[PDB]
Design an enzyme around this catalytic site. Structure first.
Site, PDB file in Angstrom:
ATOM      1  N   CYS A 107       0.635  -1.414   0.038  1.00  0.00           N
ATOM      2  CA  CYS A 107      -0.148  -0.018  -0.144  1.00  0.00           C
ATOM      3  C   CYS A 107       0.858   1.173   0.152  1.00  0.00           C
ATOM      4  O   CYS A 107       0.683   2.028  -0.790  1.00  0.00           O
ATOM      5  CB  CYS A 107      -1.144  -0.061   1.166  1.00  0.00           C
ATOM      6  SG  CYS A 107      -2.059  -1.160   1.120  1.00  0.00           S
ATOM      7  N   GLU A 158       4.370   1.095   1.702  1.00  0.00           N
ATOM      8  CA  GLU A 158       5.601   0.807   2.367  1.00  0.00           C
ATOM      9  C   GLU A 158       6.667   1.037   1.508  1.00  0.00           C
ATOM     10  O   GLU A 158       6.911   0.246   0.612  1.00  0.00           O
ATOM     11  CB  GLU A 158       5.299  -0.381   3.068  1.00  0.00           C
ATOM     12  CG  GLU A 158       4.137  -0.637   3.794  1.00  0.00           C
ATOM     13  CD  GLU A 158       2.992  -1.520   2.895  1.00  0.00           C
ATOM     14  OE1 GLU A 158       3.282  -2.671   2.806  1.00  0.00           O
ATOM     15  OE2 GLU A 158       2.081  -0.860   2.125  1.00  0.00           O
TER      16      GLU A 158
END
Lengths: 786, 786
Positions: free
Chosen positions: A432, A434
């Protein structure tokens, strides 16, 4: 000016319809094959079992070429379907066999034949999985902490790790042969009587067996393609298949030279990763950076065909799927694989890196309009205006794409964590939000989700929940005379559960190393071959573990309400607040109103924004304390996937005025309806959090009425909104741009809206595949205009 | 004068007859129970599976109290019998099931019921043993080197490790409770968020579970003793059983106070060790040092009863037995357990440590006259004459006991290897001749046997054997012009095979750590609890590996013959020698005579003695190069067990004149019949070897006509013989004192000679239990007079 988007070929429409028309199912071949292989390798060390198993699967798994494909490689016979990975867990699957097809969202079909064949699989893997070993390593105190409804370490418990961007560029250059040869050279350097080299030798041999199996796998497609070509009347299609055969034969072990070769080898690298393990967030990352040289050096291919090939990759990225247990499925709704692909940004020497492939990536999003890949753009101080405007134009399409990421924050945050300046500048995104240096990291970027709202609930209830003392017995809230006493109790509750979350993660870490070290994935990440040890055993140059806080806005709003309404203004006593909350505001609406009317996060109000900052820093500071068995540090993140709804359903009423069982806020977004001051004010609010310490990523959702994006002005305004948020040190932002009526209409007549894509959190989904609870949470989000 | 020996009670005679009258068999209960447990613990780490399996065995294994026993605890229902340890290997057993009772020596019975019950055992353990993992860790080149008839790493391959003297003294003081509490204290000290403590925790818990099962096991005897008492008429025997019950209830957890308590606790520690694993050479070591205080503080016990108690231990030590495969049984003939027990010597201060228990041990040898324990005495500069003469008197009994060990060489040798002076001064003997600091060492003191004669064979044949190139292609012997060239090639052959031997050992070392770390044994050896690591994982303060050279006399004699007959005197060419050796001297007896007439080791002739020294040093220097996975160094030893006969059968004719297939020399003893200048000359020869570098022990056999020990003079002469040898830095010496006629008569009418004990090498055995080939080797040994 807006240039608009070009039109994709008819082939793309045909390939895309294969995805949407498919009926996602669970297939049994991989499970049967890995079971068969493990029975033959009991006497072998785990790394060799893993190598031989992957060889056995790669050799005998069904192969499929779908009509009109240019890029081949299918993991399941049915499109958009899932194999089984019983090496990690499988009892959940044995429990759910008969209700998979009855789910509201993320439904899976499964043949009666598959059910019957899995029986022996369930029988053999009993006690032999990573999940069962992981549980064995945890203390009893930890096992209880894990089942308290405070956090979940399910992700790597039930299934594979993933969460990695391998060195695609390197494999594209040197081929699977080049990896093999590197492994052989290291074997030679390691010639030694030192016993330390015994285990390193098994690892290196495992890498070799794995990559040889990879070569074998590619060649099976070479053969199938010819075989199909020989049975094709249409001259054009017959020639496509012959060229597919030619290409697969070359990239079976050699590195790519042409662009088409790069695209096909890329997909094989990506595909085979997803055969060895079902860890998701297998993220392509800076696709524009490593694919562009192959584009530019290819002096025959036309831009049109280069784009079509890219569109085919896009479509293939949507072919992968992964069945999860019914509980975990709530954490990851909408059949998501979280394959993050990023374009633009800067290079190693801090110059801009926008290239033609960067733009073709954006084009592909509009050509295909599917949920994958999770397309992203890097933004920095010298981002070219036309690039940011092109991204804004993509946003206007209403696909939820792209997600925007701030180089200006992410780079320093990464260097802080031990990356060199050069490595940090080259970051890509995992899953998402990171960030990591691809090709060099075992990041564990979604090792847990942690419920911050529950901590507030347990501070108020002194660690008492459902008639059990599940947390520390912190000070009775009734006796507290200052807000400071409250923050201390809140810190102490946080310390306890973050401790058990991370130790639990560490037990799972050990389990994976002990029973599923990955010879194939490791061969493509720096230091593994050289150190002669797997990712799981700490071979990566960089090592992290990344657990997520969920409920940020709820925490700030709760804390400010407790501070103001109870301790500052003495409107109610602590006892009264505690009772009202446990009663879910029943017959004390007047107290609920006081709470709802306290300042809310997302309106540029320092009193509450700062407590959101401090509330979250408390989580973050706790996470920072821990190290993993790979010698890496824990780093916190703040993103929800889709778990804020499920988490919310496990959480009582909170001091921000939220009723029991209601969803938590998504990521670092303000709670629904609370940001009533326009989107700039909300941006200012979110930017006040510490986005540097949360280096595993923070996620900010905004949702616009389509009118806000209309015209050149619309693009200029979104671009301006983004820049101001990033200038103020925000980490990430992304936008839904859709008409509310369309979502409500999709609810009533799903069959009419099969192609409706919506942004959930760090990813987009096919709206109708999402459970109603997640659909409603998205609909209920604040809708802004500029 | 000669005091003579006292007479044992009638009970001792009864208990002894139980041993000799037994029909050794293979029992199945342990196998079934371990298999049962492992099936339930599939999801548990190896160390916990070990602990839970030990628990399951100790709770459910059959318990036996034999009639008249004062010290109780029996590993098998039938006396002198063996359980099965399928966790190490078991396929050999499945293969031999129907022919175990057909063996010439070391025959075992096994019921049809047991054979049937073992089927499921063989089935479950397929691929899951230490042996199968060990093979997996070995390279292909190593697997072949292991099956060349040069060496054998079978010992720890097919069965458990053992070869250790645990901290008996500590456990007698603090009981199993004290060990548990220490582990519980480390658990406390270790509490931390550091992941390193996760695995240590499982180790410590496993220790606890294991010691708690030990308590359970003792309590089972306590109960059974009572139940037997309740149905015993005879008042005296009823009271014995009730007292046994009382003593067991007391030492099931607590440390001992009385001498009787100490003897029983001692046996339970020793016995339980032998239940966890079947590694042999579990050696009591300095029994007189840790048992004496319990004797001296016991103000009620009489010397007679204390002696009876000791005699009961002696007999129990003979109750343990261990079945081995057909081939391995040749390496270890005579039902041997090699439980070494040493008395006398000095303490840590360098003062003499002779005590009353040292003498009661010597007395027990004569009271009992069974093969076990392998009784030994330490000798040093200030050994009291009374003690040495008493040891001599024991030697005269003709049991082959005691073995004598030289403090003066062993102590510096040990300090050289890294022991403190205090620790080295406190050494005991493991197995045959292997010294260690008890309670602090994982020594692996018999990790392999290595055939030095084969190295000579392979030097002559340039690595070529049975039409395969099995060793390096060293210089063709035909072409050699100097003895230097021969020694160089001899070194190169040595290097290659020692390398693969030690690396094979390391693979086995790793397999044991990985599938059979021992929670119970580890808890009784220093550093394990404190480091929170098993013995297999390097927990011991001191770590070694000890591989044995076999064929010292043959090597010296061969080397001198090659040097003198071929290179010095040119009596024959290298080719002529090479051809005649490959021909086994057929039709070239004149060349064999030349070789036989060359100077022989064992006659105080420097020319050959120095080559025996150097020949052995080449082996020893090679071994010193290696380290094991526990961070310990390899140290060489020079002892044969009974393998010198079997090794000899695999060895071609050698340049010393020895025909193909004949036995090799035993230990560092001269070859049979070659020592023709008296025992003193022989000691002089043997003392010229480097006994310091071979710190895993060297073994020296002499055999005397019984006239040689007659009267005070005989005793004086033996004592003087030993002193002269040790003054010259000999490591060890032991003596057979027996009439040749008696041995010959035992061969013809075995049933007439069931209690005839004879010395093999490092141990004594029941002569009629030994295969004919070992009987003959012993009979054929040089017989000396003074």
């Amino acid at each position: 000016i807006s240039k608009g988007f070009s039109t994709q070929t008819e082939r793309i429409n045909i390939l895309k319809a294969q995805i949407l028309n498919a009926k996602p199912c669970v297939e049994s071949e991989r499970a049967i094959l890995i079971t068969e292989s493990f029975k033959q390798t009991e006497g072998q060390p785990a790394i060799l079992r893993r190598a031989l198993a992957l060889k056995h699967i790669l050799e005998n798994i069904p192969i499929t070429i779908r009509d009109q494909e240019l890029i081949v490689g299918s993991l399941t016979k049915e499109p958009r379907s899932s194999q089984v990975f019983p090496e990690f867990s499988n009892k959940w699957l044995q429990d759910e066999l008969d209700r998979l097809n009855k789910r509201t969202g993320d439904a899976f079909q499964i043949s009666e034949e598959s059910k019957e064949k899995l029986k022996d699989v369930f029988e053999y893997w009993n006690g032999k999985t990573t999940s069962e070993l992981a549980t064995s390593y945890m203390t009893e105190e930890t096992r209880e902490a894990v089942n308290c409804d405070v956090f979940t370490v399910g992700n790597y418990y039930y299934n594979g790790v993933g969460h990695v961007s391998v060195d695609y560029g390197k494999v594209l250059r040197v081929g699977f042969n080049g990896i093999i040869n590197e492994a052989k050279e290291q074997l030679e350097k390691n010639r030694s009587i030192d016993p330390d080299f015994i285990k390193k030798e098994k690892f290196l041999n495992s890498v070799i067996i794995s990559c040889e199996a990879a070569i074998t796998y590619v060649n099976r497609y070479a053969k199938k393609a010819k075989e199909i070509a020989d049975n094709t009347s249409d001259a054009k299609r017959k020639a496509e298949l012959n060229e597919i055969a030619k290409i697969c034969s070359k990239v079976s072990g050699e590195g790519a030279k042409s662009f088409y070769e790069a695209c096909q080898l890329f997909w094989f690298i990506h595909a085979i990763i997803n055969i060895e393990s079902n860890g998701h967030s297998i993220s392509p990352a800076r696709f524009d950076q490593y694919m562009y040289p192959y584009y530019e050096n290819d002096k025959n291919i036309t831009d049109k065909f280069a784009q079509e090939l890219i569109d085919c990759i896009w479509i293939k990225l949507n072919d992968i799927n992964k069945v999860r247990d019914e509980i975990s499925t709530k954490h990851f709704g909408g059949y998501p694989m979280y394959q993050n692909l990023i374009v633009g940004g800067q290079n190693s020497e801090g110059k801009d890196a926008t290239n033609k492939v960067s733009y073709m990536a954006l084009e592909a999003a509009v050509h295909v309009k599917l949920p994958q890949p999770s397309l992203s753009v890097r933004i920095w101080n010298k981002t070219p205006d036309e690039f940011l405007l092109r991204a804004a134009e993509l946003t206007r399409e209403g696909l939820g794409l792209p997600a925007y990421y701030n180089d200006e924050v992410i780079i320093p945050a990464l260097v802080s964590r031990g990356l060199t300046l050069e490595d940090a500048r080259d970051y890509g995104i995992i899953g998402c939000v990171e960030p990591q240096k691809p090709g060099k990291t075992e990041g564990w970027h979604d090792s847990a989700f942690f419920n911050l709202a529950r901590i507030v609930e347990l501070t108020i209830n002194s660690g008492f929940d459902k008639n059990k003392q599940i947390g520390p017995k912190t000070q009775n809230f009734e006796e507290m005379k200052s807000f400071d006493e409250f923050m201390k109790a809140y810190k102490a509750q946080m310390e306890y559960f973050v401790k058990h979350m991370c130790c639990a993660d560490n037990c799972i870490d050990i389990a994976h190393a002990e029973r599923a070290p990955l010879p194939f994935l490791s061969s493509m990440v720096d230091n593994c071959i050289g150190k002669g040890k797997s990712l799981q055993d700490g071979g990566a140059e960089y090592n992290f573990s990344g657990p997520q806080g969920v409920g940020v806005a709820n925490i700030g709003d709760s804390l400010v309400a407790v501070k103001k309404i109870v301790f500052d203004e003495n409107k109610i006593t602590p006892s009264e607040l505690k009772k009202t909350l446990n009663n879910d505001f029943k017959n004390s609406e007047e107290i609920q109103a006081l709470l709802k009317n306290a300042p809310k996060f997302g309106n540029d109000i320092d009193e509450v924004d700062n407590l959101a900052r401090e509330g979250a820093l408390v989580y973050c500071r706790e996470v920072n304390k821990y190290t993993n068995p790979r010698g890496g540090n824990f780093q916190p993140g703040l993103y929800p996937s889709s778990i804020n709804v499920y988490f919310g359903s496990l959480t009582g009423a909170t001091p921000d005025g939220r009723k029991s069982g209601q969803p938590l806020a998504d990521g670092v977004s303000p709670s629904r309806g609370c940001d009533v001051s326009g989107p700039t004010a909300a941006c200012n609010s979110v930017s006040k959090l510490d986005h540097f310490i949360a280096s595993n990523g923070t996620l900010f959702n905004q949702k616009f009425h389509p009118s806000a994006l209309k015209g050149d002005n619309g693009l200029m305004n979104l671009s301006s909104l983004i820049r101001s948020y990033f200038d103020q040190k925000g980490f990430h932002v992304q936008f839904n741009v859709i008409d509310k009526k369309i979502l409500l209409a999709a609810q009533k007549n799903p069959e009419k809206y099969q192609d409706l894509i919506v942004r959930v959190a760090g990813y987009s989904a096919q709206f109708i595949s999402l459970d109603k609870s997640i659909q409603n949470d998205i609909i209920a989000r604040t809708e802004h205009v500029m």
